[PDB]
């Protein structure tokens, strides 16, 4: 609920470059400035003779909002012989996938083709580039000697990637072994140390890789998507991967051990061709330190009130339990054909309430297919099934849909304000947007009405003037506030009280405030962070018996408290927000004595 949508940081790339197809945060190890990484897999480059080789861009945060391409590789195609290229980098889609871990940047070209050294072929083995500091190395684990569709010739290695917490790479290639797919994990230390540009198929020791299986598993697409997390409690991140064509198109998700690539657990879809496994994510959403599994099926079809099927997509949330089992729940899309669940981004603790949160994209929802992103906050039971916020794409295109939300990355505090921030890509309009998280004010409000029971005959209180004949009591209203992160030590609150709220238009209000002689009382207030419960008293009374013959329904005293957000701003320009989970209204009720 606390993402700043009024003024996000808007970055743009070359038209037609799919700028924003992939996004990640970049944090150097020397606690230097933070940047944004953005893939533009169709961008033209200076590489000699290469058309739409694509590129990855580093983007300043706020200093300028400028983006400059990262030079992973400045060269064109190597030659096996004169007029006989060894490789084909044009339209290789470099930057289709980008990941970062401290100093390291991994970017991949899943449509990089190569020739092989024997026959003249053009096999999309895929390639990646790993850049640490000065050092950059090529990482093409599928450019092996196991050639053709039978082997890894069509593996498209790098279609999906992630880092483990122990500096292992997890790489997916959905094409290996007649599109069975394959997962490969290599130590970054091996990737750089064994690199030799004279050797096209590098022997990496301690490599982990799924193996070729029976032909029944062909066309499964293992490695279509990957995430990492520990699921046997040995501290070693394990490998999660989507397999969306498996089980005769029901879809599956495989989990393998991150130490020996042994099979650990399986999930299976419920519906044919829902593309169960298009996306996967691993994050502890309920605070038990056990990683939980999110799986997206963006083409899943729900049944409606009219009994008609409607493609809305669906996400499954599987809480890991110490017993090794999983506790699964589903979460359906809201708009038809919006493909809810195409992207799932762990956000960290967006509202800093003690539970991690998550964003789920419906990239083709909203008006004119401008895209939508849904924020789901976590809690001890699991994931709150109602989104606390909805981000709406603002740009329209004329060729391919904007696809706002097709890629996302969160869980990084780029403005060092104590709350993680979110990147959203929109490759169809060549745009990437940063949303910064506003700090959250929690408020404890109290309302006391003494005496509670009210007797009409009893009149020891005096009205302004000489009337001196009313039955009375008093209302005490208090607010207390605090927060976490960058905030000022003073806040302006606007409190409003309303006597006898239960009665609506056209109905008499039995209780009125003494001074005003009206049931509404307003009040500005000032409260300091971490201060004591600052209270205030006032006095009210009842009307004459003749005016209301309703002495049964209880009189409810209603208190509402809002905030002035502009006055609490910060150097960032980022105003705080009240915690939505704490209701900003409180009510107490008083009754009439009966004789």
């Amino acid at each position, epitope marked *: 609920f606390n993402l700043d949508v009024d003024s996000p940081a808007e970055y743009s790339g070359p038209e037609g470059s799919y700028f924003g197809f992939a996004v990640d945060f970049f944090v150097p190890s020397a606690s230097s400035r933070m940047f944004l990484l953005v893939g533009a897999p169709k961008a033209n480059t200076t590489q000699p003779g290469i058309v739409e080789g694509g590129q990855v861009l580093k983007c300043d945060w706020s200093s300028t909002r400028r983006c400059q391409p990262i030079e992973f590789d400045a060269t064109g195609n190597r030659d096996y012989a004169k007029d006989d290229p060894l490789e084909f980098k044009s339209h290789q889609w470099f930057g289709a996938s980008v990941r970062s871990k401290q100093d390291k940047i991994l970017a991949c070209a899943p449509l990089y083709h190569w020739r092989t*050294e024997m026959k003249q072929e053009r096999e999309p083995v895929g390639t990646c580039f790993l850049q640490d500091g000065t050092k950059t190395v090529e990482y093409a684990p599928c450019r092996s000697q196991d*050639i053709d569709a039978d082997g890894q010739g069509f593996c498209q290695g790098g279609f999906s990637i992630d880092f483990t917490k122990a500096d292992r790479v997890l790489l997916g290639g959905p094409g290996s072994f007649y599109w069975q797919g394959q997962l490969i994990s290599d130590q970054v230390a091996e990737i750089v140390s064994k690199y030799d540009p*004279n050797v*096209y*198929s590098i*022997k990496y*020791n301690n490599q982990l890789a799924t193996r070729t299986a029976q032909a029944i598993f062909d066309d499964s697409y293992l490695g279509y998507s990957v995430a990492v997390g520990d699921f046997n409690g040995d501290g070693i991140d394990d490998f999660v991967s989507g397999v969306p064509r498996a089980a005769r198109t029901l879809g599956m998700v495989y989990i393998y051990d991150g130490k020996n690539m042994s099979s650990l657990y399986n999930f299976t879809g419920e519906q044919m061709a829902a593309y169960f496994g298009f996306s996967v994510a691993a994050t502890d959403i309920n605070g038990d330190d056990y990683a939980d599994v999110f799986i997206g099926a963006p083409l899943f079809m729900d049944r409606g009130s009219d009994g008609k099927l409607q493609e809305v997509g669906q996400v499954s949330v599987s809480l890991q339990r110490a017993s090794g089992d999983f506790q699964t729940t589903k979460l359906n899309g809201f708009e038809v054909f919006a493909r809810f669940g195409s992207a799932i981004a762990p956000l960290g603790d967006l509202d800093q309430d003690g539970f991690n949160d998550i964003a789920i994209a419906a990239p083709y929802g909203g008006e004119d297919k401008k895209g939508i992103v849904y924020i789901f906050n976590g809690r001890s039971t699991g994931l709150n099934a109602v989104p606390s916020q909805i981000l709406e794409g603002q740009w329209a295109a004329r060729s391919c849909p904007p696809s706002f939300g097709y890629s996302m990355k969160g869980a990084t505090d780029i403005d060092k304000n104590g709350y993680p921030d979110l990147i959203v890509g929109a490759f169809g309009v060549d745009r990437a947007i940063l949303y910064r998280a506003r700090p959250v004010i929690t408020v404890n409000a109290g309302l006391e009405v003494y005496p509670s029971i009210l007797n009409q005959d009893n009149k020891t209180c005096s009205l302004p003037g000489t009337a001196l004949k009313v039955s009375c009591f008093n209302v005490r209203f208090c607010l207390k506030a605090d927060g976490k992160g960058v905030l000022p030590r003073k806040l302006n609150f606007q409190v409003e009280l309303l006597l006898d709220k239960l009665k609506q238009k056209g109905a008499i209000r039995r209780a009125l405030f003494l001074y005003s002689r009206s049931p509404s009382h307003s009040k500005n207030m000032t409260i300091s962070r971490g201060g004591l419960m600052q209270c205030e008293e006032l006095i009210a009374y009842l009307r004459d018996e003749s005016e209301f013959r309703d002495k049964l329904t209880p009189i409810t005293i209603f208190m509402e408290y809002r905030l002035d957000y502009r006055t609490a701003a910060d150097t960032t320009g980022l105003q705080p927000i009240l915690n939505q989970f704490t209701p900003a209204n409180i009510s107490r009720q008083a009754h009439i004595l009966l004789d």
Partner: antibody, heavy 118, light 108 residues
Framework: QVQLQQSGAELAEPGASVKMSCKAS????????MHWVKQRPGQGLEWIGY????????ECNEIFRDKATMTADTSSSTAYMQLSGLTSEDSAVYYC???????????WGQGTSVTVSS | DIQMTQTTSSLSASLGDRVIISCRAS??????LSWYQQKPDGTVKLLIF???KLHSGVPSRFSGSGSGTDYSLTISNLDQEDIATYFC?????????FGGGTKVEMRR
């Protein structure tokens, strides 16, 4: 840390056959071809052929087309060669060697001596 | 097939000397010639591939040269462990063929 461990010396009578092994470690066995080489005592090196371990496809020198047959067990990272119709000219050391690429062979096993006598 | 011939089957050298071994192919092999070292115990190591590329782990003393049909392996500052037989191998076309071998022995 690539290592190819070959089986021990084989003895066989003329006309019989032998089967020798070659277990790989330190790299992904299935992703690299395995070559075999013949060296008669005091003689030079003779190339027999190679096998794609993951697919079983092989190519042989015309010489050994009917002599040798190469196989591979991916689950154990082991390559096998079988010499059939043995003679005294088959008595030699037989090496396995992984494929560097660039038409070279980067790591060699220790060799398996084969002796053919009655 | 491609015939590979190492004219000198044996040469003698002293420690620190520079040794040059010659290899000739019966056809243009387009720089796909590799050099291997075999020590008396049978051990075989790859030294050079693609005419002049050092294999991981072998020392800088070894270096390779050539093109077309003529090639040469060069050992600079020969070591005691260098005494071994050196073969040359073309990898441009199947079947792979080796040279006869050149044996490097110490001088006395």
């Amino acid at each position: 840390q690539v290592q190819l461990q070959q089986s021990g010396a084989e003895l066989a009578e003329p006309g019989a056959s032998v089967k020798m092994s070659c277990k790989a470690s330190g790299y992904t066995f299935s992703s690299f071809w395995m070559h075999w080489v013949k060296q008669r005592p005091g003689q030079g090196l003779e190339w027999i052929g190679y096998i794609n371990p993951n697919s079983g496809y092989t190519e042989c020198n015309e010489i050994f087309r009917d002599k040798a047959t190469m196989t591979a067990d991916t689950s154990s990272s082991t390559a096998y060669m079988q010499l059939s119709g043995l003679t005294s000219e088959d008595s030699a050391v037989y090496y396995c060697a992984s494929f560097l690429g660039r038409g070279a062979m980067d790591y060699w096993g220790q060799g398996t001596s084969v002796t053919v006598s009655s | 097939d491609i015939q590979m011939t190492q004219t000198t089957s044996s040469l003698s050298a002293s420690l620190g000397d520079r040794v040059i071994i010659s290899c000739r192919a019966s056809q243009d092999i387009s720089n796909y010639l590799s050099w291997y070292q075999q020590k008396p115990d049978g051990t075989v190591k790859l030294l050079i591939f693609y005419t002049s590329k050092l294999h991981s782990g072998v020392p800088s003393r070894f270096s390779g040269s050539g093109s077309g049909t003529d090639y040469s392996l060069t050992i600079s500052n020969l070591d005691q462990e260098d005494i071994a037989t050196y073969f040359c191998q073309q990898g441009n076309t199947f079947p792979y063929t080796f040279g006869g071998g050149t044996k490097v022995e110490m001088r006395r």
